Amino acid sequence: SLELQEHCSLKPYNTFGIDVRARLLAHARDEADVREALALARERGLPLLVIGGGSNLLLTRDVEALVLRMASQGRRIVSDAADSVLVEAEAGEAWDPFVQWSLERGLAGLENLSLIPGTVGAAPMQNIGAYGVELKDVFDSLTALDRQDGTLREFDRQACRFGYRDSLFKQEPDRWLILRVRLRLTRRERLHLDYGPVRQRLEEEGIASPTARDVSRVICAIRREKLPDPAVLGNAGSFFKNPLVDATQAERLRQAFPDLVGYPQADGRLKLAAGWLIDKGGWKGFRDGPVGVHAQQALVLVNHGGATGAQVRALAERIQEDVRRRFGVELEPEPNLY
Numbered sequence: 611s612l613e614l615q616e617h618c619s620l621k622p623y624n625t626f627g628i629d630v631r632a633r634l635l636a637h638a639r640d641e642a643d644v645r646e647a648l649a650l651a652r653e654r655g656l657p658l659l660v661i662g663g664g665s666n667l668l669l670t671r672d673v674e675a676l677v678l679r680m681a682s683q684g685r686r687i688v689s690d691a692a693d694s695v696l697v698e699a700e701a702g703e704a705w706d707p708f709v710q711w712s713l714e715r716g717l718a719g720l721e722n723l724s725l726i727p728g729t730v731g732a733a734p735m736q737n738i739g740a741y742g743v744e745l746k747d748v749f750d751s752l753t754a755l756d757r758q759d760g761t762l763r764e765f766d767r768q769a770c771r772f773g774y775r776d777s778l779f780k781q782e783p784d785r786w787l788i789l790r791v792r793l794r795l796t797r798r799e800r801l802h803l804d805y806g807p808v809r810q811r812l813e814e815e816g817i818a819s820p821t822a823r824d825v826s827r828v829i830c831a832i833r834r835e836k837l838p839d840p841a842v843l844g845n846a847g848s849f850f851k852n853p854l855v856d857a858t859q860a861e862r863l864r865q866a867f868p869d870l871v872g873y874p875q876a877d878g879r880l881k882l883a884a885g886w887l888i889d890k891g892g893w894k895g896f897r898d899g900p901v902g903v904h905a906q907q908a909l910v911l912v913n914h915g916g917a918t919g920a921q922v923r924a925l926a927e928r929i930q931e932d933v934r935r936r937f938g939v940e941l942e943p944e945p946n947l948y
């Protein structure tokens with residue numbers, strides 16, 4: 611209540627840098643804050659919109675809701691037994707510093723997820739992943755507040771129903787509010803060097819026997835080189851999920867498009883590079899007034915300054931239609947659209 615803010619600009623709180631207003635904005639620092647905000651949204655008859663760092667979020671209009679910013683803090687080692695180490699972070703912790711924190715303690719598991727923006731609390735929503743690692747690979751459990759009952763529930767790995775950019779919380783939106791997250795990491799050496807550029811850079815810098823810290827630094831360097839920093843150019847990273855198609859459609863697509871970029875899955879279905887499909891549409895480097903497509907990262911929609919969220923969405927809708935027509939493939943956006 612001391613930090614509660616009315617008719618307040620959300621621009622500092624979304625990486626896209628869209629300027630719309632929140633009816634109320636609350637900065638929750640603990641569970642007691644979260645319950646006060648829930649209760650107040652009830653008192654006022656308002657929806658509640660939860661945000662972390664607003665790095666996977668597209669705001670398209672004034673938010674007639676209580677916006678609840680998760681600013682809880684807290685990082686600890688729960689349990690440290692026989693090289694297996696279980697760690698806990700409060701939802702409001704910044705993801706990348708939590709990763710550096712883990713690595714500096716000699717824990718391996720998160721290095722591939724270095725430098726991803728946002729918070730710990732949002733990380734399970736889309737099962738964050740990069741460089742062949744996903745949160746689910748190290749996920750032990752979380753504690754979530756049931757917004758139907760006001761009761762707490764613990765979610766173990768299976769219960770979250772993790773998938774590619776997916777979870778129970780994305781499927782049943784607006785129900786669970788994640789308070790904290792427990793991950794199981796290791797003290798023994800682990801390297802997931804699946805993606806060639808990581809492997810390649812490590813060899814160029816002459817590290818034949820790398821540690822999880824070396825990988826993290828390499829990953830940070832590649833990411834810095836190639837991803838637009840939101841500070842320069844507002845964005846929410848990859849705007850679309852990579853679609854999965856069956857071998858039927860995959861065969862038919864390949865005949866029509868031999869240069870097609872795809873990764874066949876253990877199930878045998880094919881994951882297409884969304885970026886390739888979009889590039890083939892000619893969208894790369896496109897710009898219409900304040901919105902555009904980045905010139906090297908075809909998945910990244912950008913704000914050159916002053917974009918409305920509606921303009922961003924109109925652009926994404928044009929790209930989706932172009933890809934449906936060209937390839938018969940549906941692209942799903944990744945950022946949550948309000």
Ligand SMILES: Cc1cc2nc3c(=O)[nH]c(=O)nc-3n(C[C@H](O)[C@H](O)[C@H](O)COP(=O)(O)OP(=O)(O)OC[C@H]3O[C@@H](n4cnc5c(N)ncnc54)[C@H](O)[C@@H]3O)c2cc1C
Pocket residue numbers: 625659660661662663664665666667680701726727728729730731732733735736737738739740786787788789837838839840845846847848946
């Ligand atoms: C430059 C850049 C690079 C990125 N790279 C990656 C990447 O490599 N991999 C990747 O997976 N993502 C990436 N992202 C996307 C984003 O950083 C992650 O998905 C991140 O987890 C979102 O966290 P956030 O706290 O900003 O969530 P927000 O954007 O604040 O919100 C995310 C969704 O979760 C909900 N939500 C947030 N917090 C909670 C909570 N505590 N409880 C319940 N619901 C909640 C929100 O309502 C919203 O629906 C990138 C984004 C940017 C800008």
Ligand SMILES: NC(=O)c1ccc[n+]([C@@H]2O[C@H](COP(=O)([O-])OP(=O)(O)OC[C@H]3O[C@@H](n4cnc5c(N)ncnc54)[C@H](OP(=O)(O)O)[C@@H]3O)[C@@H](O)[C@H]2O)c1
Pocket residue numbers: 739740741742804805806836837846847848849852873882883884907944
């Ligand atoms: N979600 C986001 O907002 C966001 C933003 C920036 C970067 N990233 C992630 O960071 C990594 C680097 O991103 P990037 O855009 O530069 O893509 P990249 O590394 O240039 O790879 C391009 C595309 O090919 C896939 N790919 C590449 N090597 C692969 C392999 N060995 N096995 C399976 N698939 C492979 C990636 O899928 P995946 O994306 O399925 O890994 C991605 O769709 C990727 O994992 C990407 O997801 C995500």
Ligand SMILES: [K+]
Pocket residue numbers: 665666846847848849944945
């Ligand atoms: K994204």
